[PDB]
Design a protein around this ligand. Structure first.
Ligand SMILES: *SCC1=C(Br)C(C)(C)N(O)C1(C)C
Ligand SMILES: [Cl-]
Ligand SMILES: [Cl-]
Ligand SMILES: [Cl-]
Length: 164
């Protein structure tokens, strides 16, 4: 298991524009195109992202390219952020993946806002961090995915992603 395999499980793979859990136009492996309710706007974002006039459909290779960029962007976002960087630096490799996962899903600013959870993570109070993380819109809206990510922070193992 690694961050790519982890996010691939959590995000799935779809080669045609679809709406994510929040109803936003998305493609590939959880690549958010736009929050605009306009399919045309989403298609424009897609063509720009891929560098060609797509019929709202991409190849697996193209999906994986966007995915690579997006994982890179999440890590980059964590390292540039004054709140996220110290937490990330304090974590082991498995828990680092859990933090990247959160940033991939909700964005740098969103995760940076989890002040109390971040402190507990920094303190290595894993059970307490786990409980605090669950007290969120994130957990309530995507409970199975949040449970997997939280289990990863709680245990520092890939147990939540085995047999998946
Ligand atoms: S997060 C607080 C709780 C814990 Br530690 C367990 C035992 C899982 N619970 O049922 C809660 C929600 C009270
Ligand atoms: Cl998805
Ligand atoms: Cl992009
Ligand atoms: Cl879920």
């Amino acid at each position: 298991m690694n961050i790519f395999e982890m996010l691939r499980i959590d995000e799935g793979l779809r080669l045609k524009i679809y709406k994510d859990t929040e109803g936003y136009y998305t493609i590939g492996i959880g690549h958010l195109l736009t929050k605009s309710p306009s399919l045309n706007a989403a298609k424009s974002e897609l063509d720009k992202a891929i560098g060609r006039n797509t019929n709202g459909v991409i190849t697996k290779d193209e999906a994986e390219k966007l995915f690579n960029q997006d994982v890179d962007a999440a890590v980059r976002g964590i390292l540039r952020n004054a709140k996220l960087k110290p937490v990330y630096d304090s974590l082991d490799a498995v828990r680092r993946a859990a933090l990247i996962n959160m940033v991939f899903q909700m964005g740098e600013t969103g995760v940076a806002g989890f002040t109390n959870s971040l402190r507990m993570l920094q303190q290595k109070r894993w059970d307490e961090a786990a409980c605090n993380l669950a007290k969120s819109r994130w957990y309530n809206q995507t409970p199975n995915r949040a449970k997997r990510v939280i289990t990863t922070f709680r245990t520092g193992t890939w147990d939540a992603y085995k047999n998946l």
